[PDB]
mmCIF file of C-alpha atoms in Angstrom:
data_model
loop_
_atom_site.group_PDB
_atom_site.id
_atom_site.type_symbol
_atom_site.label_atom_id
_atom_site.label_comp_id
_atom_site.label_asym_id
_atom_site.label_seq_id
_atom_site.Cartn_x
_atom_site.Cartn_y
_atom_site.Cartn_z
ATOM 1 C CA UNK A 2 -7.562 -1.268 -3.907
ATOM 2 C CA UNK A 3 -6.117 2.070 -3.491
ATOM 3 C CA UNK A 4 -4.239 3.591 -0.775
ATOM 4 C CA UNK A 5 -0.548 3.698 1.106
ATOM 5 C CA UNK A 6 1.532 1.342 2.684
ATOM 6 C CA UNK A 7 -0.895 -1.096 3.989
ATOM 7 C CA UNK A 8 -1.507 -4.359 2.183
ATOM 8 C CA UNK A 9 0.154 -7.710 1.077
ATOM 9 C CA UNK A 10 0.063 -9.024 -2.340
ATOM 10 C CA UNK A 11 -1.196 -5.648 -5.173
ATOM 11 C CA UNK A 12 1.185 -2.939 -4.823
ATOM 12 C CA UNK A 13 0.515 0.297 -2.417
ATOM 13 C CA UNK A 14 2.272 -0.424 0.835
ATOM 14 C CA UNK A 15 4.231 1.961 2.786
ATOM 15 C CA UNK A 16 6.459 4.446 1.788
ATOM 16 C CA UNK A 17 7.649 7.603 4.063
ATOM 17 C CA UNK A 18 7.855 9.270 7.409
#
């Protein structure tokens, strides 16, 4: 429900390196 790059259908995902 809340975090970064790392799920399939809400919204957070990935994002940088």
């Amino acid at each position: 429900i809340a975090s970064a790059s790392c799920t399939t259908x809400i919204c957070t995902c990935x994002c940088s390196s």
